[model samples]
Target chain A: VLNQPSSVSGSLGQRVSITCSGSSSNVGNGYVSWYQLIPGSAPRTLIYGDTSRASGVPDRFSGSRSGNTATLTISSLQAEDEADYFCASAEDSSSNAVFGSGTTLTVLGQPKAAPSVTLFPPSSEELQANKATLVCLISDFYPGAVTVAWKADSSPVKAGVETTTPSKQSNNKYAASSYLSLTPEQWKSHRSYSCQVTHEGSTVEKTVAPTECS
Target chain B: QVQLRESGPSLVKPSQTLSLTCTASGFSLSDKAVGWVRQAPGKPLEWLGSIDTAENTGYNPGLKSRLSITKDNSKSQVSLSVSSVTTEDSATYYCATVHQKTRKEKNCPDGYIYSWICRRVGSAFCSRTGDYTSPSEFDIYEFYVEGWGQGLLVTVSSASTKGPSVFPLAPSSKSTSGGTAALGCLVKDYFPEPVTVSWNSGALTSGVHTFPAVLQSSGLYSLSSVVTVPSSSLGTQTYICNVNHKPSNTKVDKKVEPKSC
Candidate 1:
């Protein structure tokens, strides 16, 4: 949940950005930097090479923090990308690195995290037929993930929702999804629609909304 | 590339409903997160929250009491409706997503996170914008950007292009007439990048470049540069500064030698 550098040139005003993921509450404190490095061709930077610098060497190089990651965008691109990027800083200089283990930068490339889910939709928007009809979705997830929600608010629901083991989004690491469906609304206000999601843990109860078909 | 834009009403009275929608040409709403931000009349930016149809979640803490963000994934559209607004809620809003990847290094964090994919627990703010706070301990949470929106110079004409904006005044200690004046002009996310800043009519001179132009919490930017033209440089030759923002260049006219005639 933290980003840090393995080893870096200890200097003053060496701008940095650390990332502390996991806790969705508050992570403004987490910072990332390039520390404990080999300063060479191997050993990809840790914490997902979250920093960047252009060509030579200069003290103006800086870094930034994103979700649970850190990105150091050095001005004039001075600092070399040829090192192990570990989340480093005066604060949590000795915390465990999360997200990106460590990355190698033989050459510079696009740096980003995949999209994931932060919130799930309620169950049953429309119920009809044999399908249970549940609706599920994710929101505010970066990097992007493939998503499928359960349909539970339709009429005459018939088919069962597709259930599959969790899989990765075609792109980023931050997201994924699944869905289910059920029979139509039996009563005008039976309100029996429900949604379940499988994530890192046991099935999660999908948030349910009030049935107001108006 | 074409981008989705949310050009909603900037002024919202207290305890009123604020409605906004984005019309995107290049992307679809079902595939990404469409979030909103507020920039005060003249302050920094604040990421109010986001709306993801995929995960069916809306994340707005400050104005959640009277906010409803929803999306028609089928139509590839997103909309925001905040009831009971106050003067404290006057700011410009925008809709953005994570850009595509390139062949070299094809992964970049989307500016906003999708709530559904997170499948996180704890008070779930569901893909629906309004309030979907599920009471539970184990919940994955997402934090929107911090700074709030503050108004910037809109523009003189309806036309979009004015070759970026020019800021002639700045926070200074002295106001002496002859004292060196620091003027600033910016090209909003200009494509192709800029090369130089030259005065009008006068021969162009290689301009200086500065970076990290104060990323204000409001998402807007403030760049600083000093023109040491003195009485002569400020006098004649149309002080038009040029910037080579790569691929293309832009020019800004400072002053005509005298503030008067």
Candidate 2:
């Protein structure tokens, strides 16, 4: 009768709990312990004897038993707590330790807003040297998912427009940059060029005006 | 500090020999040892064999007949060749430095029969307190281990429903309650569930408790129990822990002695 939920998901700063059930011959007669298995690593003891935390375990994790079930609760969940949690019942009658099917915990975080966009115009030296690339830098967005688009004179420009996937930043936000390559003549004349970034249903636009190109 | 890496072919045909190499750096091979371990998918780890720095070798008795462990001292490497591979032999192999713990193994000489004398306490079998200890007269062998703890993974195969090897940790008496001592019996690495552990000391006992068996990451189990004894009567007590596994038809009984107060 050792059973556990297949998975549990929650947002960041929330609390999560997983429970294991067993027959009277097992869980009801023995102490219960919990373990955490991160992907590709050995499992570490989360709680032992139904209540005692293992060495180096944080205070936010705790365990308890009620009737024929054992429960493990994690408060103030963080991103690193995303892993599989397993519970074991030590059988005092037969010397057997029974483990429940594991439960995977997924922690969700806040979705980031649209990023700030900064478009750099090609310099006069670049126009003289035949360089024809405009840079669209997007940064300071959370949750990582973002999209970048280019516009020339209010018309969508698709060719020669290369955008990178949003990458995670050190502060838990995301940033990306897009490059728009054009001919030297196009760079000198297209004063209505703009870079637009979209994230979390919102969009931010940055325009490189003609007078500012000089 | 030694860093061990294991490499070998991914798959092998049935009845063929599976060979693996353990390459090491940051340490002198001549001064250290390396060993091979394997884990079948979703299975407990199996220690295969090890080649020691002293050039000594030891293997798991279960795989010894088909296992060959060798070394190349010049290249700081160890090799494992297991003959007669089966689908059951599919597992990820690993290499790690051998952490050896040696002790003097005592055995009787050719002319004497080996036996342990049992002490009786109040009509029950108690501790083995005989003082026939003589290192000079006993034949001694140095015992060693191949590897222990975490190691570098070389390969994983899938492999349980098993009997457990049960033993108790050395029980020591501690002063907890007005001159009371504690005796602990530890059960390790058992499977398949419904483990019924019983503690018996041949008498009505108070302050005896069995803790729960813990589930290890490798899907094995570990359990322990503590029996409290009055220190005034600690020297004359014997305790037995019985682990009964019905699926494997295995029942293990281990006895422990309470330390003298």
TM-score, B chain alone, candidates in order: 0.41, 0.44
* Candidate 1 interface RMS: 25.5
DockQ of 2: 0.01
Query: Which regions of candidate 1 fall more than 4 Å away from where they truly are?
Result: A1-214, B39-47, B53-57, B72-77, B98-236, B239-261
Across residues A50-77, which tens digit of lDDT does each residue of candidate 2 receive?
7878767899998888988889999999
Model 1: per-residue Cα lDDT over B1-261, one tens digit each = 335656454334455577877666666666655555443433433444465545454443445667677777666666777676655665556554421111111222333333424323343555644333333222222222211122221211121222344433221223112544433233233321122344433353333222223222323333323233344344443454444332223555544223331
True contacts kept of each: 0.00, 0.00
Compared with the true structure, all predictions reach lDDT values of 0.36, 0.62
lDDT of candidate 1 over A1-214, digit per residue (tens): 2323333432222333332233332233333334323421121222222344323434455555666445654333222433344332222211111222333322222244323222222212122222232223332233222334443443333344443323222222222323332234333344534444334333444334334321
Q: Write model 2 residue lDDT over B66-158, tens digit each, in one string.
A: 998888889878888988788788666767654443323355433333345222323232333442323333211221122223333322223
Q: How far does residue B164 in candidate 1 sit from its true spot (Å)?
A: 18
